Each structure stands twice: as C-alpha cells, then as structure tokens.
Amino acid sequence: NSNICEVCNKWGRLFCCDTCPRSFHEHCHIPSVEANKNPWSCIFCRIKTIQERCPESQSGHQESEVLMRQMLPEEQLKCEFLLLKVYCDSKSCFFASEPYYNREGSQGPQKPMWLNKVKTSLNEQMYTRVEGFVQDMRLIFHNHKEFYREDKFTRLGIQVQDIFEKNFRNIFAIQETS
Ligand SMILES: [Zn+2]
Ligand SMILES: [Zn+2]
Ligand SMILES: [Zn+2]
Numbered sequence: 001n002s003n004i005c006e007v008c009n010k011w012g013r014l015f016c017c018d019t020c021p022r023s024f025h026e027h028c029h030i031p032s033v034e035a036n037k038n039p040w041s042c043i044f045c046r047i048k049t050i051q052e053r054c055p056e057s058q059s060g061h062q063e064s065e066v067l068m069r070q071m072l073p074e075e076q077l078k079c080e081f082l083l084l085k086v087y088c089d090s091k092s093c094f095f096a097s098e099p100y101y102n103r104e105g106s107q108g109p110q111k112p113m114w115l116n117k118v119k120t121s122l123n124e125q126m127y128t129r130v131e132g133f134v135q136d137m138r139l140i141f142h143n144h145k146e147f148y149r150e151d152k153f154t155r156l157g158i159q160v161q162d163i164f165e166k167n168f169r170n171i172f173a174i175q176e177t178s
Pocket of ligand 1: 008
C-alpha cells in the first residue's frame, strides 16, 4: 500500500485498500472509511467494479440524460467519487470551507456554496437527482468568478472547475464532442 493519503498526499493515520495499493485518511475518503469491513475496498475499486460488471456503461451519454438520473446507489457513488476527485486537487482548499465576502466593489453571492457543504448534503442523501449535485458544484465556481471579477484570483475557480468538468465527463461517460 501507499504510505501517503491518495487525496491530500500526506502521511498520518491511514486506512489501506484491500484491493488496490491506495491509502486514505478516514475523512479524506468519501464516504468516510467504514468502521469494520474486512476486506475493505476504496471508492476507486468500487467504481472500477461498476464498469466491469457493465462494460456498456462506458458508451457515450448525453449530459441532459445523466443529470435527470435519480440518485440510486450507483449514481450516489459516482457523485461521491467525482467530489473526491475535486478534493484530490490541492487548489480545492480554496473552496472547501464556508466562504465570506467583504471586498470593495463586489457583493457576495445570493447562494453561497462550498465543498464541505456538498459533502454533507451527499452524506445526508439530500440530492434526489444527479442534477442537484452538479448544480451545487457548478455554483461554487460561478460564485467565485462573479465575486472576484477582474482580480486574477478568479483563475482559481476556472482551474478547479476544469478538474470538476473533466472528471464529470469521465465518470459519467459523457459522449465525446468537438
Ligand atoms: Zn488525506
Ligand atoms: Zn482500492
Ligand atoms: Zn451490463
């Protein structure tokens, strides 16, 4: 097994995957690493199993169809993995915790949003469709772009949104386009 957490790249109290060499901090894994379960399989392994059981699940899909899917267990897992892939980027620190807004010439967003809030919402099964989760994720970056206007800090939102979107297209097998 790896000697650093797959998400945050730090050592510490790590839980080891039984079916792959990845390791995790308890609350870096999503969902939080389960108490018992020997063997234990991480989210990466669980996603790979989905694809192996149903190879046709990798044929291209329309985003509009994906978004209307109900959050059954497989879609729940896929959203958890997509959230985890965003946390894997170090630039996610800027969007993890509850933001505050006091900048000359800007007004804060009407609906603030952050990664830890999405994390809790997923944990508490508050999203009924994939669209719920994706809307809150995209709102994180949209709020950031609007607030930071022409400050170059706006680019952090662009960068983390790009990681989100690339991973969304990969995990949900969105049909490739030009
Ligand atoms: Zn970690
Ligand atoms: Zn694994
Ligand atoms: Zn199948």
